[model samples]
Target chain A: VMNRLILAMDLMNRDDALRVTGEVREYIDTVKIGYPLVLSEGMDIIAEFRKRFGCRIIADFAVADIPETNEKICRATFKAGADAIIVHGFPGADSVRACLNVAEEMGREVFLLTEMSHPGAEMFIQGAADEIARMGVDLGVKNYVGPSTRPERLSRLREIIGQDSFLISPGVGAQGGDPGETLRFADAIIVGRSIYLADNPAAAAAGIIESI
Target chain B: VMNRLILAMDLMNRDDALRVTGEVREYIDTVKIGYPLVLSEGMDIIAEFRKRFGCRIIADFAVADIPETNEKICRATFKAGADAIIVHGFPGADSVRACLNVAEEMGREVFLLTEMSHPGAEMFIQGAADEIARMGVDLGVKNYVGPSTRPERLSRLREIIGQDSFLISPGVGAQGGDPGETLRFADAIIVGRSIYLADNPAAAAAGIIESI
Candidate 1:
């Protein structure tokens, strides 16, 4: 489980992203590395964070591909030192399974992304979010990603995945979700610009943690 | 427009992937590079393909994230030299719009993935695939990715996106989709392992094109 404050390191530049993340190292033990940084710097950035901060790295690749392709992505991610990888459930069970299988083989973990934390998500993702959560459970998934922007939807996702399952929520800070409220359902909350872009990232993280 | 066949360069090894792709360059003017190769080789691989084969690189990232994250991913991908990036529509109009915005700014393209070709796609993606395509059309999307394995579904998606929209279908050759038949709807068919993993990739590609 994350320490209730996971930094979403989305900054694209390596020096800036790494510096900001290192600045907030004291306030976070888990860092969610997304495509922006990884694609910009390279996958070794995941290992760099792990080595530098001794933190759990979640490769938020949002793995959404056919089973064959998903397997390759998961393998490369775990091999690059991710403790876990976030995958999209909307691609259907096979794609999710592909990631899960690789994680199981690599001794890492796969977090099923049930719902997103964005307004456009309501148009179609909202309708399938619940069923996706159900599919995750049926597939023996123990970890999930839900939106913190909507507490009601988050609670519903938590209910579907049940209490024992570990769930992480994004959109807690920059995107407008309160951290304390989000922790009611999510095991940890993912924070990005609010922390990384602040004048003092560590202080921003500390403040969020203190509020929670 | 593609040359009716897009090489899905999914082979993870840079040497083998590039070698095979180079061998079949005569049959392909477009290469669909997914996470398997990009996450393995690096995004610069897109530039490498362009420099070496002079092929159009479709970063089949299946971009499925919030607007902020999606925008960052698109910027990095296009900067890395991708002619276009394939994005998932299930995340809704906003996410799709995010990619479209970046592509427009970069003078690239965003291909909306309507539905997957895999069997598990029926579980959830199939339900929203049509609506997803409709959303794409409403957003003025001009490009799309469909499934080659199901002609009816592919035809339906083509109808939804209309004849003017350039649609590419995957799951051909290796995934039980016929190349010639898939052409009825898709502007081009994506062929992967059947060619990349073949004893003679160039001959394999030539044979598939001949059959078509």
Candidate 2:
């Protein structure tokens, strides 16, 4: 059996989402409902997708707010049936801790957005690694989200932190990040447009997973 | 006629919120449902409050997601019957434009969260003021959410931006920022825990308004 892969559906609308989801269901281990689909269709879409897929569903909300607000977002996302949720790590230790507590209480996985794959992400993430790690530790977040382009930093992150933590990498194809590079360090890779936006989504997903 | 005063009920439960809201309603012109309240009660509570109070309600969501998601949040907030909704200005001009367009189509008001009441907010909002003003040339924002500490910056902002734009100033009372200093510059002062957590919320609100 192949190690499962996560697919981020960046497209909007029920027709396109349903079509793509139906076509790529086999290869997709987890389907990520990000800002696009979540905003387009609302929680009803997530609930509908959950009904259709019945697999792990990740809410890439990347919730970044004060502690009280973050806690509520965490609860709302969990109530919407997200198996895992993404939150920003830059809001200080208390916010991160509050989010993790909500996730833990709701029995949902929390993925902390450590270092994004965007070009200028390093200008912030790299500069704040120590604070991020401290927050992760304080929050007891076992899962981390970052870009695959910085394997050296990821290595440093793993060394500084413990092995119990998991890394979710999300900058492949459309975003110009490499999965092969990510596989060396990440526990899971989140691929979006490259697979879902491809002409043949299933084949595209299979190809990417095989490459990884 | 009484000028509307909005109170921030951050980190308060339903009972606490109701108690504070009842007190504030006696003297407040309106009440703001900030990120905390939205996250805590979801949309149901907003609707309930709107129906109960019959006062103008502003949803200070400060939504900053992609275009599609932002729209959904806007629509949901609108349906929740918010008189005004907020979006972040940092997501670039296009996102702000999209939000404004949506609010226009919905016949609702849009407030841009230009610079929150934070210490280093000037570093970004001040740096981008000119660019933002240019973007708002024809399709203008009705209001701007900013800090109350920098009256000079607000004066400059009013000069560069159109005079038609209102200013919603946070960081009064407990934040140690004075409403008196902000009164001449700000059209509205948003007080949160300072009023809600006070021994006498109604009195606190009246005092702030009187001082202003």
Candidate 3:
């Protein structure tokens, strides 16, 4: 099994998010939250996770905005205790550059969305993946988010972003990805429902980890 | 001034946001809050604007997420009293459709980002504007966001989305757009600093409204 794995706490309810965080904190490298989790628990969601369990937190907001606006959002996430945040690359170079600047200023990192796990992603991210990746390199992004189910896309993105940068893959678990195949390209696999919704989340996590 | 003005509350300070809200509420049709406002003041910022001024609030998160996650965030924004929410059309058809479904459920609207105001937008948004506009039309998105500086872009998008589906034009004033020509196509011009940062915002808003 690969040593790198992140648990996505995408649940919208506070009790459920906290329940899973308590059960699987030690087994995961980072706990990822997006608008759903953040909306239900508020920005204090980051603080609560920090208080209950001392683990790295990732805010997967996939922020898409202009540079000046992007900086503020990135700063807000970092101030709220996110070690990193997910940002959409489609907003173009300046937005990514501004986000990268904020990440550098705050001593954090950004996970640029290179490709998405969902099918609809082909409509935009697919068309712009190479250009977005090149822009990421020129703009100073060191981390990426790609699809766990598509190794071909991941391998290609890896080629464009180069080996120095790392990529995080979502779409494992209920998305029907083979982690065995996915971990070959992803620096880390983001496993959600298959682990979080199981009768024994830790055991499920371990199974997926061992399978990798 | 034009009655179709949308004042942007893009300040990242609570007191500044409140001061502007106090001054310009009666002069504008909708008070728009993006990353700066939301990151600084929280979702309750929408509620605060409502409590203080009783004006329509637009949450300009430009949300980009998959179907399930997209629905949650859209509902969260509407539940907090946002009259409308901006969603990134890059997530493709299902994502926009999901957001639209949430808006319908809550008696609200979803403004799809057709293109952006920044020069960097040429990197990605320019090529896909027509496709995104077509998708928005197919998905029943009645609100579109494009730059006011480019009346031609606004005119083309207006034709594609149809006159019935209104467009929100930003990049006026400080962005150096002529609202006179922009108003010819855009249903509402989103004026930010030209109104929000004036010595007296109400007077500034009135001047622009009267001009329109």
Candidate 4:
């Protein structure tokens, strides 16, 4: 069973972030910060949360660029105290290799966004998951972030890679993804607006945790 | 004549950025602040530059998201003392409109990244440029940052967008893009590694300014 609930902090301000985070701190094991909040308040917000919460933090950067640029982003994310950083696998082997190199240097874990929850994600992630799995065999990324809607589709990916690899699933609740179905393949499910936007966010988070 | 000099500050600390701004005060005009510097030092970087320079400062955010997210980014960019905010055009019309609305509300300028200097840029920018122009009528976006290495391609884009739209060309020195040919379509040029990596960066920038 998935042990802890991951709250997605997609709010754009410090006040809302603090409120939501404080409300759910007791229940949730991790907080996923997306682009909007990250871009708005900068690392100060992350530092503040770290100071207060001391929970597992993931920076959903989904960073994609040239080798040098990827290294720079990886260094920045590590400095910001991100336990796990997400990079797009669609940028080909060199880009993935660059990120992997940075992760090794920094002594941090890197998660590749093999499949996202968005509607048009299939156009890229679905077509490329196999190629990335083969590449990952040598590159040595232990985790992959993909869509949970299609748990049946992940069998081939797992066969190519292995059971040791973790799957971080998004697109639940607000995005209309079924958590029960998603939990079959996903080692962990990322819940964003569903819990964060609720009247009693901690209660919502607790309910999800109980369900899983 | 087009201005080819762009002074970018990538200092990881605020004190270093302040010291560098003072050192390069006269030589540099446009100061660029991106993700790494912004995340490390915080918005104080923008405020410090605005207080010291009091000229054109570009917030190189490269934001890609939905309408709501774009609106929030625009408002935040204006509040942070950005004279202009740079956004990627791939986020579609709603994102563009949201940015335009925020710019209008805050009375700041918007600079769209229609075509980047990267090799794979042609695959997206050609179609994106046409769509942005169609969606944003009277949006007052007159500048585009891209590589205009091929005279014919630049000429064609200029013919379509007309004289009012300024292309801020990149890839001059290190990338072997000719300054004289780039001048045919570019109103301003952004030089990064080629100028910054030189022995005497200020002198190199001065020479490029003279040539263009």
Report model 2's TM-score to 2 decimal places.
0.49
- Between prediction 1 and prediction 4, the one with superior lDDT is 1
lDDT of 1: 0.87
lDDT of 2 by residue, A12-34 (tens): 88889888887887676468788
| Lowest lDDT 10-residue stretch of candidate 2 chain A | A47-56
How many clashes does the backbone of model 1 have?
Answer: 0
lDDT per residue (tens digit) for residues A46-159 in model 1:
877865665668899999999999999988887676768999999999999998888655445789999899999999999999999999999999889999999999999999
Q: How many clashes does the backbone of model 2 have?
A: 4
Candidate 4: how many backbone clashes?
0
Give model 3 RMSD, 1 decimal. Answer: 20.4
Q: Give the lDDT of residue A63 in candidate 1.
A: 92
The true-versus-predicted C-alpha distance at residue B104 of model 2, in Å, is 34
Could you say which candidate leads in TM-score? 1
List of clashing residue pairs for candidate 1: none
Question: Which lDDT tens digits does candidate 1 get at residues B1-212?
Answer: 33589999999989999799889987877889999998898887887786567466889999999999999999888767676799999989999999888775544678999899999999999999999999999999988999999999999998888887888999998889999999999989999999988999989999998897
Which DockQ-derived CAPRI band holds candidate 2? incorrect
| Alpha-carbon DockQ of candidate 1 | 0.01
TM-score of chain A of each: 0.98, 0.93, 0.95, 0.93
Candidate 4: tens digits of C-alpha lDDT, residues B166-200:
56666676766777788778766666655555666
Question: Fnat of candidate 2, please?
Answer: 0.00
Q: Which ten residues in a row have the lowest lDDT in candidate 1 chain A?
A: A100-109
